[PDB]
Amino acid sequence: MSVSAFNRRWAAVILEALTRHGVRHICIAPGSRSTPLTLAAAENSAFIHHTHFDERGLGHLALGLAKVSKQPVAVIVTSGTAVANLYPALIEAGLTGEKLILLTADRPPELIDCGANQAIRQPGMFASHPTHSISLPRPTQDIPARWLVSTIDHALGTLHAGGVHINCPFAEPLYGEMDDTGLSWQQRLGDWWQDDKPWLREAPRLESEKQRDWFFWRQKRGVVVAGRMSAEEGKKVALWAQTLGWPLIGDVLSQTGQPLPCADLWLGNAKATSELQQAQIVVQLGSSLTGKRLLQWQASCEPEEYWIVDDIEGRLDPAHHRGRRLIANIADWLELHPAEKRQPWCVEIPRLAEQAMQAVIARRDAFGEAQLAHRICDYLPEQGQLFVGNSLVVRLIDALSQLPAGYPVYSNRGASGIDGLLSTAAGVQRASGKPTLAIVGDLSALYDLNALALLRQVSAPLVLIVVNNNGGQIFSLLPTPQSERERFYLMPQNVHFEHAAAMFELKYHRPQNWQELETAFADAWRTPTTTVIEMVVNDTDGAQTLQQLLAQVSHL
């Protein structure tokens, strides 16, 4: 009748159950109340274990691992504010689909709402953000193991996307030698312990039916909009749009190759929007569109029908057009709605896109963040991946660069938080093992500064560029009021990152010109470690350059 042993055998069912649903990575933060979960995880040979001391960063590490691997990733934390720190990553996963399985240790019911240390009300604390929430009962052998595994199996098997909150109360004692308490209870599952399948297989698939009138609609003047999708999907969408003869507006997140690049610039030209007024249908694949001019064009356009195809659920059109919301894997959907070669209908836009890119090329020389974004293709690691941060960088790359088709791009553009970008990048790198280029702003790097600890362990080179324009210079692009702008928006912190790199024994470069930047890259890709490259630029030059290029292209 050992409580500590039974706690561990209850936890062992939970952890073993997760292995039957593809969970391999598990991210663990330290604690005492989490002991049953952590020891079950440590003893289970199925897992790759990652650790970190900041639970907010731990959640984002898990997000990054899940984002790239397309597997559910588990997280273990102890009770209290440790749990609350998982909320940012959980929210992001709810928007972009990562399957995060949050195993949150709790005090038992007799220690809630009585002033006990590190005891808070945990069931329901993430409100509607998890896809599923399981509030487990106080462990007892009077609840059979088959109930516990079935409950796990239901949550994981029916999970289309997003997080699962599994709250796990345990009473003390937590420590002690294992004895045989609970062994016969576990053995009621019989040879499930040697199986590779769930105890309960419940795996309904959610998918829209094929659209039977596609072969009518594909004959019309259409536009393809490509948002966030996989690298392979981007290549397939590019070929499909080309065959249809429809213009493709491709986001930085699409990996389509952006055949009509600089859309954030050319969509500001009235000749382009006039031509797009002829579109009778818009088929958008993927979502979370980046650029302002694209979002404004989406909001203004009035095709007879607007379709959004994505593997995310729910409405995805913030302008609420008449049309269709089609839940599907994009590659599968394209096979069911194929293209037939048809003469292209756009005449003006291809010329404008070429002129827009030429205007950007003309400005490539200055050593600034707009130019870095424009030139970033030249710096992508071979057989690698790009992790793009939030704020100006994603907008500048989207507006000013043409990224190669099929070259993987990752981001946190559901809620677009600046709170977890370094820890997410670490997980993105570890999941695929690829060389990684990550680009973030200065406030973003400060926000997740302690994730430099995680970047001490990468399996291939990771270059972290920190663009230091001394504050959040998106607020110099937006029409914020001048008098309050510095103190209440930009918030310059007047730091550099050399000492941050040194604290974590990371290589550091602060290049002053393009030649020094290319030398720093050549150095960085040589070893499976993280290099920090700080690009110090004048505060508002990037915002102003984008504004100037917008105006120039609007007048062509």
Ligand X SMILES: Cc1ncc(C[n+]2c([C@@H](O)CCC(=O)O)sc(CCOP(=O)(O)OP(=O)(O)O)c2C)c(N)n1
Please report how close the Cβ of residue 48 comes to a copy of itself at its closest, in angstroms.
Answer: 13
Question: What residues between 364 and 393 interact with a copy of itself by CB under 8 A?
Answer: none
Which pair of tokens denotes residue 153? Answer: 């199996």
553, 554, 369, 382: which is closest to 476 by C-alpha? 369
C-alpha 500: how far from its chain's center? 25
Question: What residues between 492 and 511 interact with a copy of itself by CB under 8 A?
Answer: 493, 495-497, 499-500, 502-504
292 to 70, 320, 522, 547: CA distances (angstroms): 29, 17, 35, 12
30, burial (CB in 10 Å: exposed 0-12, middle 13-18, buried 19+) = middle
**258/473 with CB nearer ligand X:** 473
Only one of the segments 25-33, 396-404, 457-465, 509-517 lies at the binding site for a copy of itself (rule: CB under 8 A); that segment is 25-33
Rule CB under 8 A: choose which of 7, 38, 423, 424 binds a copy of itself. Answer: 38
Please report how close the Cβ of residue 126 comes to ligand X at its closest, in angstroms.
Answer: 16
Only one of the segments 39-47, 178-186, 304-312, 512-520 lies at the binding site for Mg ion (rule: CB under 5 A); that segment is 304-312
Q: Are 272 and 260 in contact (CB under 8 A)?
A: no
Please report whether residue 48 would count as binding a copy of itself according to CB under 8 A: no
Please give the size of the binding site for a copy of itself, defined by CB under 8 A.
85
C-beta nearest to ligand X: residue: 441
Tell me how far apart the 2 most distant CA atoms of the chain are, in Å. 81
**275/311 with CB nearer Mg ion:** 311
Phi, psi (rounded to 5 degrees) for 499:
-70, -30
**45/117 with CB nearer ligand X:** 117
C-alpha 46: how far from its chain's center? 25
C-alpha 397: how far from its chain's center? 17
Please report how close the Cβ of residue 323 comes to Mn ion at its closest, in angstroms.
Answer: 38
Task: Write the binding mask 67 to 106 for a copy of itself: x where contact by CB under 8 A, - elsewhere.
Answer: -------------xxx-xx-xx--xx-xx-----------
Please report whether residue 287 would count as binding a copy of itself according to CB under 8 A: yes
Residue with tokens 């790759």: 48
Please report whether residue 35 would count as binding a copy of itself according to CB under 8 A: yes
**230/444 with CB nearer ligand X:** 444
3-class DSSP state of 343: coil
Beta bridge partners of 308: 284, 325
**311/534 with CB nearer Mg ion:** 311
**3/449 with CB nearer a copy of itself:** 449
Please report how close the Cβ of residue 443 comes to Mn ion at its closest, in angstroms.
Answer: 5
Rule CB under 8 A: choose which of 46, 127, 239, 377 binds a copy of itself. Answer: 127
Task: Write the binding mask 211 to 250 for Mg ion: x where contact by CB under 5 A, - elsewhere.
Answer: ----------------------------------------
At a CB cut-off of 8 Å and minimum separation 6, what does 212 contact?
A: none
Question: What residues between 406 and 435 interact with a copy of itself by CB under 8 A?
Answer: 413, 415-417, 419-420
Please report how close the Cβ of residue 418 comes to ligand X at its closest, in angstroms.
Answer: 4
Edge-to-edge order in the sheet of strand 323-327: 248-250, 222-226, 281-285, 305-310, 323-327
Phi, psi (rounded to 5 degrees) for 91:
-65, -45
In the complex, which residues of this chain contact ligand X (CB under 6 A)?
A: 30-32, 55, 78, 80-82, 117-118, 390-393, 416-419, 441-444, 469, 472-474
- 86, interface contact from Mg ion, ligand X, Mn ion, none, CB < 5-8 Å by kind: none
- 311, interface contact from Mn ion, Mg ion, a copy of itself, none, CB < 5-8 Å by kind: Mg ion
Question: What residues between 473 and 492 interact with a copy of itself by CB under 8 A?
Answer: 475, 478-481, 484, 487-491
- 469, interface contact from Mn ion, a copy of itself, Mg ion, none, CB < 5-8 Å by kind: Mn ion
C-alpha 39: how far from its chain's center? 29
169 to 31, 80, 136, 556: CA distances (angstroms): 14, 12, 7, 65
How far is Cα 378 from Cα 372, in angstroms, rounded to an integer?
10
482, burial (CB in 10 Å: exposed 0-12, middle 13-18, buried 19+) = exposed
Please report how close the Cβ of residue 509 comes to a copy of itself at its closest, in angstroms.
Answer: 16
Rule CB under 8 A: choose which of 120, 327, 339, 536 binds a copy of itself. Answer: 120
Phi, psi (rounded to 5 degrees) for 309:
-105, 125
197, 384, 224, 408: which is closest to 303 by C-alpha? 224
Rule CB under 5 A: choose which of 98, 311, 442, 534 binds Mg ion. Answer: 311
**311/419 with CB nearer Mg ion:** 311
- 473, interface contact from Mg ion, ligand X, a copy of itself, none, CB < 5-8 Å by kind: ligand X
How far is Cα 125 from Cα 298, in angstroms, rounded to an integer?
36
Please report how close the Cβ of residue 464 comes to Mn ion at its closest, in angstroms.
Answer: 14
Please report how close the Cβ of residue 295 comes to a copy of itself at its closest, in angstroms.
Answer: 8
Q: Are 430 and 488 in contact (CB under 8 A)?
A: no
160 to 204, 294, 405, 433: CA distances (angstroms): 9, 29, 28, 26
In the complex, which residues of this chain contact Mn ion (CB under 5 A)?
A: 441-442, 469, 473
Please report how close the Cβ of residue 556 comes to a copy of itself at its closest, in angstroms.
Answer: 27
Question: What residues between 11 and 70 interact with Mg ion by CB under 5 A?
Answer: none
123 to 12, 64, 168, 187: CA distances (angstroms): 21, 25, 9, 29
- 78, interface contact from Mn ion, a copy of itself, ligand X, none, CB < 5-8 Å by kind: ligand X
Helices marked H in 218-280: 231-244, 263-266, 270-276
159 to 20, 145, 417, 508: CA distances (angstroms): 14, 22, 24, 42
Please report whether residue 171 would count as binding a copy of itself according to CB under 8 A: no
- 117, interface contact from ligand X, Mn ion, Mg ion, none, CB < 5-8 Å by kind: ligand X
- 480, interface contact from Mn ion, a copy of itself, Mg ion, none, CB < 5-8 Å by kind: a copy of itself
